[PDB]
Amino acid sequence: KCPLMVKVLDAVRGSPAINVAVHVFRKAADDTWEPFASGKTSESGELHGLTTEEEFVEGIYKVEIDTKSYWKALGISPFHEHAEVVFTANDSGPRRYTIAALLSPYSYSTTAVVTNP
Amino acid sequence: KCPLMVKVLDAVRGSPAINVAVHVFRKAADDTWEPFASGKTSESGELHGLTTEEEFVEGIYKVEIDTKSYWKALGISPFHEHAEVVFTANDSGPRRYTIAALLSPYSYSTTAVVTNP
Ligand SMILES: O=C(O)c1ccccc1/C=N/OCc1ccccc1Cl
Numbered sequence: 001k002c003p004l005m006v007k008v009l010d011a012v013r014g015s016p017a018i019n020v021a022v023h024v025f026r027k028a029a030d031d032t033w034e035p036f037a038s039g040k041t042s043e044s045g046e047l048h049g050l051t052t053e054e055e056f057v058e059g060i061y062k063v064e065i066d067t068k069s070y071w072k073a074l075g076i077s078p079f080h081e082h083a084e085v086v087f088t089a090n091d092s093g094p095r096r097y098t099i100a101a102l103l104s105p106y107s108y109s110t111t112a113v114v115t116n117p
Numbered sequence: 118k119c120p121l122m123v124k125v126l127d128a129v130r131g132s133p134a135i136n137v138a139v140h141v142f143r144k145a146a147d148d149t150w151e152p153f154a155s156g157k158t159s160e161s162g163e164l165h166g167l168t169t170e171e172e173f174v175e176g177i178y179k180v181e182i183d184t185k186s187y188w189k190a191l192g193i194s195p196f197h198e199h200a201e202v203v204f205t206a207n208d209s210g211p212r213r214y215t216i217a218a219l220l221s222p223y224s225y226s227t228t229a230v231v232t233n234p
């Protein structure tokens with residue numbers, strides 16, 4: 001809710017991208033991707049409540065946005081399997097992260113907004 | 118000049134992104150990512166010759182663009198560890214895949230151009 005939020009928009013419809021599955025992973029000491037949190041975007045395109053300040057420790061995180069499943073519910077066969085956002089988090093102390101993604105069938109854009117509480 | 122080309126642009130400097138490492142992987146039957154091809158973008162930001170028509174069979178591929186090292190070499194603090202483009206390669210008719218990426222320190226945009234020249 002506070003420390004990690006994901007927002008997804010649809011560049012074809014000019015709308016939030018609703019009901020998009022998002023899976024977050026964190027790299028473990030053995031270099032594997034351990035499951036960290038998951039959820040689905042709301043009617044606003046936003047996904048809150050993935051983690052807490054306590055659990056969102058330093059590490060390398062991967063946010064996987066299940067874009068192919070999204071387009072495959074709207075009649076479009078898209079190019080990408082998903083959109084992946086991989087970043088180191090909290091290495092200089094806690095921050096709040098918003099990961100935004102803008103989706104088209106053959107393209108996506110992503111940006112991050114990082115704030116210090 | 119092959120079935121798969123990668124082009125990388127720099128949105129801060131308004132230039133090709135030169136000397137960016139690019140690693141391509143193919144998904145194996147056990148769902149792991151197997152190294153497939155790699156190189157570094159040229160002075161034009163392009164990477165040709167990754168694969169051949171013979172070897173680039175249908176399957177799921179991941180193109181990892183090593184953006185963090187690119188920004189670090191410029192003295193710029195970036196957000197992402199790398200940019201990842203994951204897609205299924207499709208044989209329906211003669212097709213050439215160009216993966217293009219536009220890089221900023223906290224953002225990237227990617228698109229696919231799938232043509233038949
Ligand atoms: O693709 C090509 O053959 C090509 C050839 C010459 C010069 C540029 C490009 C791709 N540049 O495309 C721009 C772009 C790429 C990715 C995301 C957003 C944007 Cl605006």
Ligand SMILES: O=C(O)c1ccccc1/C=N\OCc1ccccc1Cl
Nearest residue numbers: 007098100101102109110111112113
């Ligand atoms: O809307 C919000 O509340 C928001 C807040 C913080 C960060 C991102 C966004 C979504 N918008 O930014 C994403 C975007 C806009 C235009 C072009 C490309 C892209 Cl990726």
